[model samples]
Target: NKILLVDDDRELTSLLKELLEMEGFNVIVAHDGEQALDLLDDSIDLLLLDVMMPKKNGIDTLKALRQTHQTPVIMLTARGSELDRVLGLELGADDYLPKPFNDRELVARIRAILRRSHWSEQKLAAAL
Candidate 1:
């Protein structure tokens, strides 16, 4: 379970990374969208992205990334802005989480996304 967790807040990243590691996942931390892009490659199994960043917002990054990488993404938004949320979905984020979030909610949502990805692949294979 390789996860790329991107955000500008170091403390938040530390706490989240600790939690995920305890749950037995390998996690990488990036501070923003540009850093996230640098870390992007063939190996990451999932992405946890923040919508507001310094250089590139999550939505813009998602649009650019979707053109290249289909790596699963879970967009994290704090504003609870429906427009950003819906636009993210239209652009192809695998899941969305609004902030002021609980650890349990995040962990459960992460697992759900991973499970769905796995199930989708299995279903496709079965069809084949």
Candidate 2:
């Protein structure tokens, strides 16, 4: 599976890339939302987006992206930032995770969303 991991924290992004690679995923890293949008394509199976980013915040990026793409996105918000979390969901993020989230839970959520998207795609193909 392929994942686009977008965050402004270089250290955390690299670490998460390594972790996701170890889990047998093809990981792409972007330090900001603009870079993330530039790197996005249909081959990407999922997106992990951080709400606080330079150039473009996750919410705006997601808003623009949803206009032309239905890529599943999991937003990362600051702890206790209820507004961002709710706004992200309202903007069409598939899910949201607070900062300082557990690695296991992150991976689990990614897998769950991927599974659902995949299943829906299969259903669409069958209907066609």
Candidate 3:
């Protein structure tokens, strides 16, 4: 499972990366939307995107990214605004998580998103 975890907080990234790595996932960290864009390739199975950043925010990055990449994205936002959460979903984020989150919640969300993605693909294949 290849994951691209995007966030500007270095400390948070380190903690999250450690947890994910221990869970047997290959985690790649990107600090900002611009760097996340550069890392947006087919190799990534999923994205853990953060809403607030210096160079280009997660929403804008998602807009640009949805142009080509359909990889599932689980957006992480510090702001508890419903608008941002709704916007993230409207823009094609697979799921959304607010910051200051528990490790279990984050891991559960990741698993749920990946499970749904896989289930959707399976459903489509069955339809054929």
The whole-model lDDT of each prediction reads 0.87, 0.90, 0.91
Which residue window of length 10 is worst by lDDT in model 2? 76-85
Which scores higher on TM-score, 1 or 2?
Answer: 2
Clashing residue pairs found in predicted model 3: none
Better of 2 and 3 by TM-score: 2
Q: Estimated TM-score per prediction?
A: 0.90, 0.93, 0.91
Off-target runs (Cα >4 Å) in candidate 1 are: 123-128
- Local distance difference test, candidate 2: 0.90
> How well is each residue in 84-124 modelled by candidate 2, as lDDT tens digits?
77888899999999987999999999999999988998999
Give the clash total for candidate 2. 0
Cand. 1 TM to true fold: 0.90
lDDT of 3: 0.91
* Residue 41, candidate 1: alpha-carbon lDDT: 87
Top model number, TM-score: 2
RMSD for each of the candidates: 1.7, 1.3, 1.6
